[PDB]
Design an enzyme around this catalytic site. Structure first.
Site, PDB file in Angstrom:
ATOM      1  N   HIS D  15     -15.601  -2.352  -9.052  1.00  0.00           N
ATOM      2  CA  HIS D  15     -14.471  -2.954  -9.717  1.00  0.00           C
ATOM      3  C   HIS D  15     -13.672  -3.678  -8.641  1.00  0.00           C
ATOM      4  CE1 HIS D  15     -10.486  -3.337 -11.259  1.00  0.00           C
ATOM      5  NE2 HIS D  15     -11.015  -3.272 -12.469  1.00  0.00           N
ATOM      6  N   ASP D  17     -10.517  -4.350  -7.894  1.00  0.00           N
ATOM      7  CA  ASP D  17      -9.422  -3.645  -7.266  1.00  0.00           C
ATOM      8  C   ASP D  17      -9.905  -2.532  -6.351  1.00  0.00           C
ATOM      9  OD1 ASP D  17      -7.311  -5.194  -8.462  1.00  0.00           O
ATOM     10  OD2 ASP D  17      -7.263  -3.831 -10.224  1.00  0.00           O
ATOM     11  N   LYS D  18     -10.908  -1.780  -6.845  1.00  0.00           N
ATOM     12  CA  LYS D  18     -11.461  -0.719  -6.038  1.00  0.00           C
ATOM     13  C   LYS D  18     -12.195  -1.239  -4.818  1.00  0.00           C
ATOM     14  CE  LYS D  18      -9.844   3.201  -7.085  1.00  0.00           C
ATOM     15  NZ  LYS D  18      -9.310   3.247  -5.694  1.00  0.00           N
ATOM     16  N   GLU D  43      -3.531  -4.772   3.343  1.00  0.00           N
ATOM     17  CA  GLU D  43      -3.791  -5.153   1.971  1.00  0.00           C
ATOM     18  C   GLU D  43      -5.039  -6.029   1.939  1.00  0.00           C
ATOM     19  OE1 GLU D  43      -1.903  -3.493   0.283  1.00  0.00           O
ATOM     20  OE2 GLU D  43       0.206  -3.666   0.802  1.00  0.00           O
ATOM     21  N   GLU D  56      -0.127  -5.696   8.244  1.00  0.00           N
ATOM     22  CA  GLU D  56       0.448  -5.398   9.536  1.00  0.00           C
ATOM     23  C   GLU D  56      -0.276  -4.246  10.194  1.00  0.00           C
ATOM     24  OE1 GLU D  56       2.600  -4.835   6.665  1.00  0.00           O
ATOM     25  OE2 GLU D  56       2.678  -7.031   6.467  1.00  0.00           O
ATOM     26  N   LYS D 167     -16.111   0.156 -15.676  1.00  0.00           N
ATOM     27  CA  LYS D 167     -14.905   0.841 -16.133  1.00  0.00           C
ATOM     28  C   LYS D 167     -15.304   1.845 -17.204  1.00  0.00           C
ATOM     29  CE  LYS D 167     -11.024  -1.449 -16.322  1.00  0.00           C
ATOM     30  NZ  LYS D 167      -9.959  -2.398 -16.723  1.00  0.00           N
ATOM     31  N   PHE D 236     -21.277  -8.872 -20.327  1.00  0.00           N
ATOM     32  CA  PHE D 236     -20.572  -8.652 -19.070  1.00  0.00           C
ATOM     33  C   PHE D 236     -21.527  -8.975 -17.924  1.00  0.00           C
ATOM     34  CE2 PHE D 236     -17.918  -4.913 -17.002  1.00  0.00           C
ATOM     35  CZ  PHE D 236     -17.574  -5.680 -15.932  1.00  0.00           C
ATOM     36  N   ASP D 244     -12.716 -11.284 -12.067  1.00  0.00           N
ATOM     37  CA  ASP D 244     -11.350 -10.766 -12.098  1.00  0.00           C
ATOM     38  C   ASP D 244     -10.922 -10.556 -10.642  1.00  0.00           C
ATOM     39  OD1 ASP D 244      -9.119  -9.413 -13.269  1.00  0.00           O
ATOM     40  OD2 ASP D 244     -10.095  -7.496 -12.878  1.00  0.00           O
ATOM     41  N   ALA D 245      -9.784 -11.124 -10.253  1.00  0.00           N
ATOM     42  CA  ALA D 245      -9.259 -10.893  -8.928  1.00  0.00           C
ATOM     43  C   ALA D 245      -8.919  -9.440  -8.708  1.00  0.00           C
ATOM     44  CB  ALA D 245      -8.028 -11.753  -8.701  1.00  0.00           C
ATOM     45  N   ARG D 250      -3.862  -1.422  -6.923  1.00  0.00           N
ATOM     46  CA  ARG D 250      -3.762  -1.768  -8.334  1.00  0.00           C
ATOM     47  C   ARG D 250      -4.491  -0.781  -9.221  1.00  0.00           C
ATOM     48  NH1 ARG D 250      -1.864  -7.083  -9.795  1.00  0.00           N
ATOM     49  NH2 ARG D 250      -3.026  -6.701 -11.698  1.00  0.00           N
ATOM     50  N   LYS D 251      -4.889   0.368  -8.653  1.00  0.00           N
ATOM     51  CA  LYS D 251      -5.549   1.438  -9.419  1.00  0.00           C
ATOM     52  C   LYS D 251      -4.882   2.778  -9.092  1.00  0.00           C
ATOM     53  CE  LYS D 251      -8.177  -0.790 -12.096  1.00  0.00           C
ATOM     54  NZ  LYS D 251      -7.027  -1.710 -12.169  1.00  0.00           N
ATOM     55  N   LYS D 271      -3.236   2.498   4.498  1.00  0.00           N
ATOM     56  CA  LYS D 271      -2.018   3.003   5.118  1.00  0.00           C
ATOM     57  C   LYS D 271      -2.296   4.230   5.961  1.00  0.00           C
ATOM     58  CE  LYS D 271       0.849   1.499   1.147  1.00  0.00           C
ATOM     59  NZ  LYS D 271       1.678   2.043   0.067  1.00  0.00           N
ATOM     60  N   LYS D 275       3.043   6.310   6.538  1.00  0.00           N
ATOM     61  CA  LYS D 275       3.394   5.807   5.223  1.00  0.00           C
ATOM     62  C   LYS D 275       3.329   6.997   4.258  1.00  0.00           C
ATOM     63  CE  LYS D 275       2.373   1.844   7.433  1.00  0.00           C
ATOM     64  NZ  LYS D 275       2.291   1.790   8.904  1.00  0.00           N
ATOM     65  N   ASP D 277       3.942   7.222   1.236  1.00  0.00           N
ATOM     66  CA  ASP D 277       3.262   6.988  -0.027  1.00  0.00           C
ATOM     67  C   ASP D 277       1.962   7.739  -0.119  1.00  0.00           C
ATOM     68  OD1 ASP D 277       5.030   5.166  -1.228  1.00  0.00           O
ATOM     69  OD2 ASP D 277       4.042   3.432  -0.271  1.00  0.00           O
TER      70      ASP D 277
END
Ligand SMILES: C[S@@+](CC[C@H](N)C(=O)[O-])C[C@H]1O[C@@H](n2cnc3c(N)ncnc32)[C@H](O)[C@@H]1O
Ligand SMILES: C[S@@+](CC[C@H](N)C(=O)[O-])C[C@H]1O[C@@H](n2cnc3c(N)ncnc32)[C@H](O)[C@@H]1O
Ligand SMILES: C[S@@+](CC[C@H](N)C(=O)[O-])C[C@H]1O[C@@H](n2cnc3c(N)ncnc32)[C@H](O)[C@@H]1O
Ligand SMILES: C[S@@+](CC[C@H](N)C(=O)[O-])C[C@H]1O[C@@H](n2cnc3c(N)ncnc32)[C@H](O)[C@@H]1O
Ligand SMILES: [K+]
Ligand SMILES: [K+]
Ligand SMILES: [K+]
Ligand SMILES: [K+]
Ligand SMILES: [K+]
Ligand SMILES: [K+]
Ligand SMILES: [K+]
Ligand SMILES: [K+]
Ligand SMILES: [Mg+2]
Ligand SMILES: [Mg+2]
Ligand SMILES: [Mg+2]
Ligand SMILES: [Mg+2]
Ligand SMILES: [Mg+2]
Ligand SMILES: [Mg+2]
Ligand SMILES: [Mg+2]
Ligand SMILES: [Mg+2]
Lengths: 381, 381, 381, 381
Positions: D15, D17-18, D43, D56, D167, D236, D244-245, D250-251, D271, D275, D277
């Site tokens: 996918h 994003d993954k 990123e 960074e 998915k 598909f 799809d970008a 985003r997941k 990260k 971080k 997060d």
């Protein structure tokens, strides 16, 4: 009777193409400072807000591309968004891969350094003319000096409205003399330079004549008939990459002889010595200037060519314009006896692993600062 | 005695620089199909997986850049990741802004079309030589034809190991004859072409000699002394943009005269007619070929130059190599009486709003297909 | 006894992720202004000097991406290289293709609008709480208002050292009351905001307390025990994309409920109504707020989910935290009788072809400005 | 009566994003292998033919981004233009700068490691549920396992039409039991997976039921009422970044609890431990799972929050859903006595300088492979 016009141009350090040449050579120099045998083929592209590096580098160096690019742009003078470009805040993108292993194996892998192959095929020319002491055409010498004067007056604050992006163009009337050429007068000068919003056209045109042209061009060449095109577009506030995309290797005639001589098509900047586009063009200049300073010719064109993977040139040709008592065949024989144009020998003779390339990337590669290719070789014959 | 060597090169449709030229001109043509007065300055950059468009376009057209770029790459033949590049799946990035309003106001805003200013300063040359019917140097004609033959044999499936990226180089031995040049023999040929992993060097070298060189080069030019450098690197599997970054306007000598004549430095592709780099170089070719086909010269070089915003050329010069009974001054007067080299007149004479530019962007802009600049003008004098 | 802490954050308009959300929605709105049925999936990336658009758009609109992007950045306030980013001079790169035809055929091709399929699979939640009139958690309401106050004081010139990039965070002490929650006091506030080089920390911290916090947060919530972390890093001159890369859809909790409720993972910005990530989350908010304003619940969470190509939701769930006399089963039945959660019906009810999306892309999508999803539906039961 | 539906989704390794999450973590791991104290904020963006790295990094490592990116894409399975993406031939672009010095000075410069500040503000949640042995919601466990099964059957060649982009989505009917939840049955399953051109829908749907669903989901959960949406779009073929970008982060719900629990909004991948997060979400998971495996709760949500530059959390909250005999206040006191949630202590407890991050970046960060945050801490009270 017997007179003709010839025109050449130059561009300033902040012209977008020249920005790219300078960045490419800043990258080359950064690599060479750490790894004298770096293989570098670095193209730069510049557009609004962007420097992109694309190409092929195989090197033991660790180079901080962000830092190197930004420092080069800083030197040029693009340091604020009011000027259209800012080294501090522009985007730097990097798309640099290793040199193709197929190239490497065919060119330099496992080869004695003197016997390295040319890094590509191609043809290259060298040229020299006795019309100036530095053996360059007067048209381009003057064009370069006009851009240098703009940069000087920008940097010293006497014309603070100037920005880094400039172009100049000089048309000289010549007489010929047994194949040599003799400058008579400047027929036309063009200067275009990026400027701040507040200065008016008349102020600029007056300054360009009085403080730039008169400072650079001997009065004996300027007369009532000389035509001046000063800021001929009327307005040039938008400039640098914002006004026009830049690429490495798009000023190859500015880099060389201004339309005089000939060109084989290869760009100089961003390339290490194994790329004969640079090293063999430098060597051909060295041969040409050696023939003229040696008193054999007044004016001469030299062609050389190569095949990828092959050390010795495929062809060498000498054209003396009728300015020697020796035949072109005799001059060719002198060249062959005195020069070894293998890239792995040129590198030694011309010190081509030294990180001095950024200094070559504006105001022409030839006719200045006594680089090794500008120091004649003493010829035996 | 009296003989010399001269070398020229050419590249194929899939050479990365030439890919860029073709894409830039595909973009220009796409705009011109909808808006004949589009202002286009489209630079292309190619590296592994990437086509970037950067530059300036002001047009009423709606152009799907994704589609136009991919179609151009498809035509070239890069259609699978096994070949190193695939039109279906590569990245297309677009960084195209409007033309600078400062340029527009100085060049074309509110100006009668015939009186539009040059779109930039610069110098340009035209050249013609009677050594071939098409008035081009034999060295580059042959070099182009070798690349065309590779593409033909790739496309017809007889050498299915071929890929689109190729380079050729031809060295001819010439005699001179009262300033004109006479080909004698081919001294050296280089061919390098990207290939699939499975074909061996000997199979390639045999095919390149027998099916490419012999098919293109007259046997009368090839003899026991001719040197062949066929796949001289030994291996060329990696190619196209993956092997070497490409940029628009990095093959300007391939595009023109192969080292013969002279060049003013400006690139052709991606530019509309107001960019005199293209239109005035085409017009200068037209003048040169008109002088040779008109019987005035056997060989001739024409220089022209411009200032941004100014319609008429700043200078015009004619060099006939001693191949006319008329003086160069007389030829210049004939040129001035017969040609109007304002860009807004060249556009009409040479039909430069027509979307035929992609066809110019490989195999040279001159000497083929009876484009308007190849059809001599009948001269009055 | 019975008390707990809860924390939520918000970010300002110039936070790099939020810049991206705003740009993505500026692009969406630009398309919708011309083509109400545009299919838009526009991701934005921001880093030093760069805005990149990447994604998929199929639309009849002609959108000038350069212009739209730059205008959005201008609105935010990044207008000079001294601030780290400038709309006038940044790079804008575009990598936008058509929507996949495979998606199109499975979702919307040839389907009656009410019966369009969901544009993707996924799950979405809506939430409402009676703790504020606008039915939002106090923690995030306050966090948003602190960022809005910073922008106000920046724009009106009373704190001219402020820059657009900011973050806030509010921790509230709550009591629970039969599943509902009751704010008691603010436990901790964090504010970080980009600033000019010249202002000192003490000046900033004093201003942030006196002019920002006290202006926004009722004094009854602040006491001797409240902890303030004001400019806790000590220095924040570098900011915006230069300090931290931004992406669309990286503030999805800021966009929604601040940690309260739940989230299904889908981003809002840059997406047309057929992307149920946005439309069905808006509809779920509408359901939740309708249940609370209708007096059925004090607090409620709604889940919905979809399959690509299928119109009706796959599942609907209601969780009332014990704050209704009706069972969750009864509430679900009321929801099903009163709402049609097909995307092609939500679009009509919530007016989702209207170009109002950029207004949603900072300060949260919910609890403000009486957007259609904030106007309760009157329920029949 | 007492039953409800809940839905969660997962995505496969290919996918888009993954892909980005995996690449970001491949970059992190590459740095950590050489410099355990690397500061990384990488990123990734993916679209047709392109991987862009933006962010960074301050590190002593020398990382070959080209190589690292391409290897990650190779592992995923995108190795040919027929699949829509090829690691060998895609564009890799790099826009990675140093960490902001303003951040560095406020977070970690000159600070004892245990007393390093949080690298940012934010809020984070941990969750655990006794409904499965691994203390994860059954909905997302099943969704992940369906994607893992697709990848298994792709890689072993038994369903060679499968491509890497997939998915899944699982809706379970639950009963509640004193705040805990008890799975009853699978209500709906969605599977969408990219496929080759030649396989028909019926072949795919049969395989997805028989070889994927039945292999993964216990038969006791599937009955006559279960709804199957298998390849619901119908086609598909286009997939991965071409369809799809993708972007990193985003997941975030797929990465965590599938809609259960809560989320504070921060992404994990790309990260380093400073971080919060990532590190504090991992620690919060560790706390939650320690409370459930310790027998104190059946189900629990933990919130923590931080300010940039401050070591200790600003707030900690425990919500036990009524599933403990101890009050939430008592549980909070147990947590505070047993855990130190400073990032410079979490790093030691959870071994967060170890380069194991790429392994976390598909199939969820929690509930598998006995990572340190999955090994309960034995609690003293
Ligand atoms: C005029 S531009 C080339 C054509 C341009 N790409 C276009 O879109 O028309 C070439 C160079 O001219 C100079 N230039 C830019 N704006 C100019 C202006 N307003 N007046 C004169 N010269 C300008 C800069 O040196 C620039 O790099
Ligand atoms: C050799 S490359 C230029 C130097 C290169 N950028 C480097 O990194 O060394 C120039 C052109 O030569 C051709 N070329 C690429 N790989 C080659 C190989 N293995 N053998 C011969 N020619 C090659 C292609 O036409 C390419 O565009
Ligand atoms: C701190 S950064 C994220 C971590 C960062 N990517 C790194 O390299 O460490 C996240 C956000 O914090 C804010 N920020 C940036 N520089 C900051 C500073 N010096 N002090 C406080 N917050 C800062 C901005 O809002 C930024 O978008
Ligand atoms: C459908 S797309 C998102 C919407 C899309 N950006 C658009 O332009 O409409 C989201 C994910 O669905 C999957 N997908 C892509 N093409 C698909 C298709 N034809 N059928 C089903 N799922 C698809 C891929 O996993 C993709 O990353
Ligand atoms: K040359
Ligand atoms: K240009
Ligand atoms: K020319
Ligand atoms: K190159
Ligand atoms: K949601
Ligand atoms: K970031
Ligand atoms: K979280
Ligand atoms: K997307
Ligand atoms: Mg140029
Ligand atoms: Mg070349
Ligand atoms: Mg090239
Ligand atoms: Mg030019
Ligand atoms: Mg972020
Ligand atoms: Mg989603
Ligand atoms: Mg996505
Ligand atoms: Mg965050």
């Amino acid at each position: 009777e017997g007179t003709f016009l010839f025109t050449s141009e130059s561009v300033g350090e902040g012209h977008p193409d020249k920005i790219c040449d300078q960045i490419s050579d800043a990258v080359l120099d950064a690599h060479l400072q750490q790894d004298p045998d770096a293989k570098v083929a670095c193209e730069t592209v510049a557009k609004t807000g962007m420097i992109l590096l694309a190409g092929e580098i195989t090197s033991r160096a660790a180079v901080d591309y962000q830092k190197v690019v930004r420092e080069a742009v800083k030197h040029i003078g693009y340091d604020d968004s009011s000027k259209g470009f800012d080294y501090k805040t522009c985007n730097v993108l990097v798309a640099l891969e290793q040199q193709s292993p197929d190239i490497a194996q065919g060119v330099h892998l496992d080869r004695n350094e003197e016997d390295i192959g040319a890094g590509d095929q191609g043809l290259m020319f060298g040229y020299a003319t006795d019309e100036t002491e530095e053996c360059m055409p007067l048209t381009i010498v003057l064009a370069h000096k006009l851009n240098a004067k703009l940069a000087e007056l920008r940097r010293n604050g006497t014309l603070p409205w100037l920005r880094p992006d400039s172009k100049t163009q000089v048309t000289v009337q010549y007489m010929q003399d047994r194949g040599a050429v003799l400058p008579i007068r400047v027929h036309t000068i063009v200067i275009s330079v990026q400027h701040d919003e507040e200065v008016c056209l008349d102020e600029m045109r007056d300054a360009l004549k009085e403080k730039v042209i008169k400072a650079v061009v001997p009065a004996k060449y300027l007369d009532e008939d000389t035509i001046y095109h000063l800021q001929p577009s009327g307005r040039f506030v938008i400039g640098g990459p914002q006004g026009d995309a830049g690429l490495t290797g798009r000023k190859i005639i500015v880099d060389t002889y201004g339309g005089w001589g000939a060109h084989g098509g290869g760009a100089f900047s961003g390339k290490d010595y194994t790329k004969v586009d640079r090293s063999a063009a430098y060597a051909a200049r060295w041969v040409a200037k050696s023939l003229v300073k040696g008193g054999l010719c007044r004016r001469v064109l030299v062609q050389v060519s190569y095949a990828i993977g092959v050390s010795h040139p495929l062809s060498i040709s000498i054209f003396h314009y009728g300015t020697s008592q020796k035949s072109e065949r005799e001059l060719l024989e002198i060249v062959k006896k005195n020069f070894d144009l293998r890239p792995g020998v040129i590198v030694r003779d011309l010190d081509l692993k030294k990180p001095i390339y950024q200094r070559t990337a504006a105001y022409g590669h030839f006719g200045r600062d006594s680089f090794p290719w500008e120091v004649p070789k003493k010829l035996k014959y």
